[PDB]
Amino acid sequence: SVSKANVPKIDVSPLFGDDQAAKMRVAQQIDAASRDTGFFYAVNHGINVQRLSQKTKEFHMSITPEEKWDLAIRAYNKEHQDQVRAGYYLSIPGKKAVESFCYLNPNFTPDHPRIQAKTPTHEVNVWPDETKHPGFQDFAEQYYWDVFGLSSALLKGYALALGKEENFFARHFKPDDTLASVVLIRYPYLDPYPEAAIKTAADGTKLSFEWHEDVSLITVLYQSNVQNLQVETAAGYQDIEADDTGYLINCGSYMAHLTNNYYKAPIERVKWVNAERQSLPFFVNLGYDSVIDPFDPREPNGKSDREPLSYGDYLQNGLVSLINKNGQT
Ligand SMILES: CC(C)[C@@H](NC(=O)[C@H](CS)NC(=O)CCC[C@H](N)C(=O)O)C(=O)O
Ligand SMILES: [Fe+3]
């Protein structure tokens, strides 16, 4: 038997406004979900997710094997040593079904001082030819800023939920330095579906991606309408319902660190489903040198002995460890 996770739908629209009491009522709902299963759906978010899905499908379904090699990250193309994060993540027919395209802050250009300094985790995005993919780069860059704006509002809700002023997290989430990423993931329908691309969990469930905590402050995720995600609870994994009209939100392990685990990073995994679908996360990452002072809302004085952790170090280590543990995607 597999039970179903409680995933409340939260109208986040007050977080864009100036009704402070309405924002507190949003924050209470975020607090409740964050202390329960860890997930909620953000509704009335203001983003056109139909267009996001349409433009993403047009890209996934028209890009050619030649273009994938040309955009491939270093794990698939030794010529591209500077591409550890941004670029194309190839499928391997017969072995690996998933493929994806990841891009970073569009403000990371050769002029940017973090690029000049060669700081880890900063890279200049790579893009297909405009004539072969008309409008794609423009769509993808505008989406980055659209979901950045939603994420900033959500971070105001999380700050208020934890008893802080609304800019406690958002003040570190800035267009000039954010390490946030978008990933456009295609999970294909395949007939036959190669068993080599299916993992078996300890509890017997067939999986496409194994258990993990997210490497993020929060994760802001759109998926098409195919149920696949599960969250771990003490009584076992529970199914998270799909909703292709909203964004599924959860905290990452940076949030758990800084709240002394008061808002835990939920453990999630991806069930194997033989269905064509999209998984489009935005990982809300701060700047390379961002440090939030840990606290513990459970204590009257909010005191935590946890050491402040620089976001860049957290991200570099977390992305490597996730590849080591759950495979190169
Ligand atoms: C569960 C979804 C969010 C999605 N999983 C994922 O995106 C998984 C687990 S959160 N995330 C990752 O592998 C980290 C990608 C980091 C990215 N290349 C970057 O440089 O910033 C999936 O559908 O598999
Ligand atoms: Fe995850």
Curated annotation (Swiss-Prot):
Isopenicillin N binds at residues 85, 89, 181, 187, 279. Changing residue 281 to A/I/V: Strongly reduced the catalytic activity. Changing residue 96 to E: Strongly reduced the catalytic activity. Pathway: Antibiotic biosynthesis; penicillin G biosynthesis; penicillin G from L-alpha-aminoadipate and L-cysteine and L-valine: step 2/3. It comes from the Eukaryota. N-[(5S)-5-amino-5-carboxypentanoyl]-L-cysteinyl-D-valine binds at residues 85, 89, 181, 187, 212, 214, 279. It is found in: Cytoplasm, Cytosol. Keywords: Antibiotic biosynthesis, Cytoplasm, Iron, Metal-binding, Oxidoreductase, Vitamin C. InterPro entries: DIOX_N, IPNS-like_FE2OG_OXY, IPNS-like_sf, Isopenicillin-N_synth_CS, Oxoglu/Fe-dep_dioxygenase_dom. Isopenicillin N synthase; part of the gene cluster that mediates the biosynthesis of penicillin, the world's most important antibiotic. IpnA catalyzes the cyclization of the tripeptide N-[(5S)-5-amino-5-carboxypentanoyl]-L-cysteinyl-D-valine (LLD-ACV or ACV) to form isopenicillin N (IPN) that contains the beta-lactam nucleus. The penicillin biosynthesis occurs via 3 enzymatic steps, the first corresponding to the production of the tripeptide N-[(5S)-5-amino-5-carboxypentanoyl]-L-cysteinyl-D-valine (LLD-ACV or ACV) by the NRPS acvA. Monomer. This is Isopenicillin N synthase. The gene is ipnA.
